[PDB]
Amino acid sequence: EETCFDKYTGNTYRVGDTYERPKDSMIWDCTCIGAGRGRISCTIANRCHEGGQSYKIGDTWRRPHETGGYMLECVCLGNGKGEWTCKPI
């Protein structure tokens, strides 16, 4: 059967199956390409993470303030860069 194996995760994938693979202190979105011995194709994911947990594009993680004593509220904007915006109260 057409399946690709990623030694990083340890689970095989059928053709057209995408998964998550941690590459160099990062999370990669990988897909399995058929034909041959199951070629593995991996490309970075269009998301924003770091700090403590992962964050999606346009997502929010309104949590306390790192440099303040009040609940901080921040957002994440993609646009192929990885920017964020917060407005504490």
What is residue 79's DSSP assignment?
T
Q: Are residues 6 and 33 in the same domain?
A: yes
- What is the span of the domain harbouring residue 57? 46-89
Q: Are residues 52 and 84 in the same domain?
A: yes
> How many Cα atoms within 13 Å fall on the side-chain side of residue 9?
19
Q: Are residues 27 and 51 in the same domain?
A: no
In angstroms, the CA 1 to CA 38 distance is 9
Task: Tell me whether strands 3-5 and 12-14 are parallel, antiparallel or unpaired.
Answer: antiparallel
**DSSP notation for 12-38:** EEETT-EEEEE-SSSEEEEEEE-STTT
Q: How many CB atoms lie within 10 A of CB 25?
A: 6
Q: How many CB atoms lie within 10 A of CB 26?
A: 11
Query: Please, are residues 58 and 46 in contact by the beta-carbon 8 Å criterion?
Result: no
CATH code at 5?
2.10.70.10
What is residue 69's DSSP assignment?
S
Query: Which H/E stretch holds residue 20?
Result: strand 18-22
Region of 10 (left: φ > 0; alpha: ψ -120 to 50; beta: rest) is: left
